[PDB]
Enzyme design. Structure first.
Site, PDB file in Angstrom:
ATOM      1  N   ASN A   1      18.564 -42.049 -31.415  1.00  0.00           N
ATOM      2  CA  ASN A   1      18.432 -40.728 -30.813  1.00  0.00           C
ATOM      3  C   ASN A   1      19.561 -39.810 -31.285  1.00  0.00           C
ATOM      4  O   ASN A   1      20.701 -39.933 -30.843  1.00  0.00           O
ATOM      5  CB  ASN A   1      18.457 -40.853 -29.288  1.00  0.00           C
TER       6      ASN A   1
ATOM      7  N   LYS B   1      19.813 -36.753 -30.662  1.00  0.00           N
ATOM      8  CA  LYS B   1      20.099 -35.758 -29.639  1.00  0.00           C
ATOM      9  C   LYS B   1      20.203 -34.403 -30.344  1.00  0.00           C
ATOM     10  O   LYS B   1      19.550 -34.195 -31.367  1.00  0.00           O
ATOM     11  CB  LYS B   1      21.390 -36.112 -28.911  1.00  0.00           C
TER      12      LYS B   1
ATOM     13  N   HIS C   1      14.354 -39.022 -21.110  1.00  0.00           N
ATOM     14  CA  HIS C   1      15.759 -39.304 -21.396  1.00  0.00           C
ATOM     15  C   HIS C   1      16.592 -38.795 -20.224  1.00  0.00           C
ATOM     16  O   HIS C   1      16.236 -37.790 -19.607  1.00  0.00           O
ATOM     17  CB  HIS C   1      16.210 -38.615 -22.692  1.00  0.00           C
TER      18      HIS C   1
ATOM     19  N   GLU D   1      19.300 -37.158 -20.064  1.00  0.00           N
ATOM     20  CA  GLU D   1      19.791 -35.793 -20.210  1.00  0.00           C
ATOM     21  C   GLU D   1      18.724 -34.792 -19.795  1.00  0.00           C
ATOM     22  O   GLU D   1      19.029 -33.718 -19.279  1.00  0.00           O
ATOM     23  CB  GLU D   1      20.243 -35.548 -21.651  1.00  0.00           C
TER      24      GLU D   1
ATOM     25  N   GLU E   1      18.797 -46.673 -19.419  1.00  0.00           N
ATOM     26  CA  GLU E   1      20.057 -45.992 -19.652  1.00  0.00           C
ATOM     27  C   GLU E   1      20.975 -46.208 -18.471  1.00  0.00           C
ATOM     28  O   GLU E   1      20.669 -45.781 -17.358  1.00  0.00           O
ATOM     29  CB  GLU E   1      19.832 -44.500 -19.804  1.00  0.00           C
TER      30      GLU E   1
ATOM     31  N   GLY F   1      31.812 -41.591 -18.149  1.00  0.00           N
ATOM     32  CA  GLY F   1      32.975 -41.092 -17.441  1.00  0.00           C
ATOM     33  C   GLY F   1      33.610 -42.115 -16.514  1.00  0.00           C
ATOM     34  O   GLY F   1      34.452 -41.769 -15.686  1.00  0.00           O
TER      35      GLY F   1
ATOM     36  N   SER G   1      25.871 -47.558 -24.250  1.00  0.00           N
ATOM     37  CA  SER G   1      26.726 -47.455 -25.420  1.00  0.00           C
ATOM     38  C   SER G   1      26.488 -48.657 -26.324  1.00  0.00           C
ATOM     39  O   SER G   1      26.750 -49.795 -25.945  1.00  0.00           O
ATOM     40  CB  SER G   1      28.192 -47.400 -24.996  1.00  0.00           C
TER      41      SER G   1
END
Lengths: 246, 248
Positions: free
Chosen positions: B9, B11, B93, B95, B163, B169, B209
């Site tokens: 991806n 993005k 996704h 996002e 995901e 973070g 990740s």
């Protein structure tokens, strides 16, 4: 004088075949020499359309994001738009504001980034039926415009499109006079709130239902500098609209 | 078994120069023949990538709408995606769910429409840190999955990517076990609520990740069938990820 600007927002429509038909209209049909024409196409066809359309005609993305690149799956940026040759971008369209919930602030940030990135912008504004009936037309368009203005210092490459969203489903479109009334109030707001020179030079397109039948009367309104055409942009009739001033 | 599937991806990244460099990685790089490879690119370069990428590698759009055409400025349809030759589309996704607020049902409708339109789909799901900490990991992923199941009758062309949004973070990513714990639980849910065969044959990618340093241990997990790769998909490292399952 303000150069007449006619944008064709294809929305989510098109394919290679259909695009060859539509570009056939532009190349073919007689185009008014005093009309700046822009065509808004789906991202997947931006480069293709930009190659098949005369350099004189603008090619616009129908949306973009506020940064050059990033973790934003499904978005494209001004840099990408410029990368394929496109020179315009439509932002703040009512379908994006309402169906996809983009806020005044986001739209503002997007406009700002597009302009700073070298893109010409068509920023859309417009009030809904409930807002108009509540007598909030001016409140709404002034708020949307104010948000954009907060992040824009130079309007030379900006074109504002007024969408009479309230007319949809109403059975009747806005009358040429109703459209005119909104354009003049907006230009007035721009003169008093931004700058008199900007107000007198900024093109404000009528973004409601524009057809062969009403384009001429609409085009003759003092504060209407063009159109952001919807469905008609997919048909040959778009040529007639481009020549509404003729 | 389930064929190892690795998606890249991009993005919101790329341009003609960068795309030629990335297509180069894929073209020269020795790619394991047992791995199904897909690359998700910005709509602007959909056709461009499809024409430059080998027919063996799938080209995915990063999103699409739920109808063939309409008054949806800024949206593209599966019909357009196919018109330029692409065969995949990434939907749901994180996002798009979190930043652009796409709902579980809109995602389901898009998945249904995309599949019906002849596209293969990487449907994404995943819980945030708030939800995970509140003990709703299974609640969220099952809910998101259930919504899609309500609109899908054929899972043959669907690949689910989990995901671990909760890991951003936080400082550290999801451990392979933590990833495996979710994958297994989802697979089990699918076998129970959809079908045994579906659960046993559906590819579930890990969309957290994924780097060259952690791909092998991750791909070793029993219920991880591949990866939906982010950042690494723009670098040569993508090849190593694609070859996560090769002995040498």
């Amino acid at each position: 004088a303000r150069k007449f600007v006619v944008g064709g927002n294809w929305k989510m429509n098109g394919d290679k075949k259909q695009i060859n038909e539509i570009i056939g209209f532009l190349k073919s049909g007689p185009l008014n020499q005093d009309t700046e024409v822009v065509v808004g196409v789906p991202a997947i066809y931006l480069e293709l359309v930009r190659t098949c359309v005369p350099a004189s005609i603008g090619v616009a993305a129908q949306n973009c994001y506020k940064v050059p690149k990033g973790a934003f799956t499904g978005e494209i940026s001004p840099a990408m738009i410029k990368d394929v040759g496109a020179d315009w971008v439509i932002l703040g369209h009512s379908e994006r504001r309402q169906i996809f919930g983009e806020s005044d602030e986001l739209i503002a940030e997007k406009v700002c980034h597009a302009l700073e990135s070298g893109l010409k912008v068509i920023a859309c504004i417009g009030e809904t039926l409930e807002e108009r009936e509540a007598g909030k037309t001016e409140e709404v368009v002034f708020r949307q415009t104010k948000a954009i203005a907060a992040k824009v210092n130079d309007w030379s490459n900006v074109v504002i499109a007024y969408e009479p969203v309230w007319a949809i489903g109403t059975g009747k479109t806005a009358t040429p006079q109703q459209a005119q009334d909104v354009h003049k109030a907006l230009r007035q707001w721009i003169c008093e709130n931004i700058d008199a020179k900007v107000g007198n030079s900024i093109r404000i397109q009528y973004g409601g239902s524009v057809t062969a039948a009403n384009c001429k009367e609409l085009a003759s309104q003092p504060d209407i500098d063009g159109f952001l055409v919807g469905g008609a942009s997919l048909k040959p009739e778009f040529v007639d609209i481009i020549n509404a001033r003729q």
